[PDB]
Amino acid sequence: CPICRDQKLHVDFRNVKLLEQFVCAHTGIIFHAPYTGVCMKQHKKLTQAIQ
């Protein structure tokens, strides 16, 4: 994935600069995995993160 091919990336609630690019700027809703291409695990972790 984008997220896990690079291990130095950390999915948290803290980094807004990472979580920003997984949310639609105008619509303020997250992308489903296929839009992005992340794996299901990292996508669930990303939703829970943005929350």
Partner 1 sequence: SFFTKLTADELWKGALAESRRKDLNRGQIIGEGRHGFLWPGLNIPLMRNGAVQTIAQRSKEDQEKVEADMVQQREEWDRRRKMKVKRERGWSGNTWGGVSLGPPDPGPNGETYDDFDTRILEVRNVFNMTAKEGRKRSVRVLVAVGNGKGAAGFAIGKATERADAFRKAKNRAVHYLHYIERYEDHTIYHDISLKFKRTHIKMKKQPRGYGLHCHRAIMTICRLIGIKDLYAKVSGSVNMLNLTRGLFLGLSRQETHQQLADKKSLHVVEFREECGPLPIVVASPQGALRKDPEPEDEVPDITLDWEDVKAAQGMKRSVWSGLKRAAT
Site for Zn ion in 1-51 (CB under 5 A): 1, 4, 39, 42
Of 7, 8, 17, 27, the residue at the interface with partner 1 (CB under 8 A) is 27
DSSP string, 8-40: T----SS-HHHHHTTB-TTT--BPPHHHHT--H
What's the alpha-carbon Rg for the chain, to the nearest Å?
10
Least Å distance, CB 36 to Zn ion, is: 11
Of 35, 44, 47, 48, the residue at the interface with partner 1 (CB under 8 A) is 35
- Which residues bind to Zn ion, rule: CB under 5 A? 1, 4, 39, 42
